[PDB]
Amino acid sequence: AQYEDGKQYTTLEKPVAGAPQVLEFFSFFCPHCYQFEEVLHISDNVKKKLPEGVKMTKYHVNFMGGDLGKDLTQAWAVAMALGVEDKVTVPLFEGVQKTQTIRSASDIRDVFINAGIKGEEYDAAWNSFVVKSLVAQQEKAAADVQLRGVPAMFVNGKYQLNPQGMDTSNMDVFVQQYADTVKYLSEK
Ligand SMILES: O=C(O)Cc1coc2cc(Cc3ccccc3)ccc12
Numbered sequence: 115a116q117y118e119d120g121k122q123y124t125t126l127e128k129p130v131a132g133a134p135q136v137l138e139f140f141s142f143f144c145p146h147c148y149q150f151e152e153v154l155h156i157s158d159n160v161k162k163k164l165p166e167g168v169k170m171t172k173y174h175v176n177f178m179g180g181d182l183g184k185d186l187t188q189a190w191a192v193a194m195a196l197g198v199e200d201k202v203t204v205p206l207f208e209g210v211q212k213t214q215t216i217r218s219a220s221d222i223r224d225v226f227i228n229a230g231i232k233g234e235e236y237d238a239a240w241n242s243f244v245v246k247s248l249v250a251q252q253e254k255a256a257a258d259v260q261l262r263g264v265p266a267m268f269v270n271g272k273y274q275l276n277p278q279g280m281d282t283s284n285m286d287v288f289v290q291q292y293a294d295t296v297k298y299l300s301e302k
Pocket residue numbers: 146149265277278281282283284285286288
């Protein structure tokens with residue numbers, strides 16, 4: 115077959131019932147995830163190959179960066195609760211990996227302040243139980259598949275993208291293969 119288990123994707127030997135249609139996991143510490151955001155735009159290109167209105171979810175993970183990694187999962191919960199993902203994703207990636215000016219939870223807060231989120235709103239969300247629950251939701255989603263690597267994408271809680279098996283000589287061909295594999299898995 116043109117698409118094969120073990121090549122463009124793998125299949126969860128323990129499937130996950132009732133998961134998001136398209137579920138991505140990333141870390142602001144993950145060097146491949148930086149590229150998925152800034153130069154490959156994987157999420158937008160997958161979204162454009164899927165039918166209108168499909169649900170796409172993106173969660174942060176704890177396993178990179180120790181203390182700061184868990185701070186970043188809580189900050190991502192804040193971004194989701196406030197609906198400001200598009201405003202903070204790039205400055206958080208660059209603060210962690212490019213300028214390395216993010217060394218503490220206070221530095222993370224500064225990114226939101228600079229992006230126009232009021233301090234009172236940030237702190238209220240940061241300490242909220244809604245955000246506590248969103249942190250739990252991100253951990254539970256990753257736990258379901260004992261995620262040990264990012265960036266990861268799961269389709270219908272059944273299939274996991276395998277970018278290791280895709281052409282990397284050309285960045286746009288890679289994105290195309292990745293998105294076409296998601297489309298194939300979604301129609302499956
Ligand atoms: O860990 C792995 O090998 C899999 C993998 C996950 O994300 C990636 C991003 C790139 C970046 C790139 C893409 C296309 C052309 C040049 C450079 C390369 C490989 C991967």
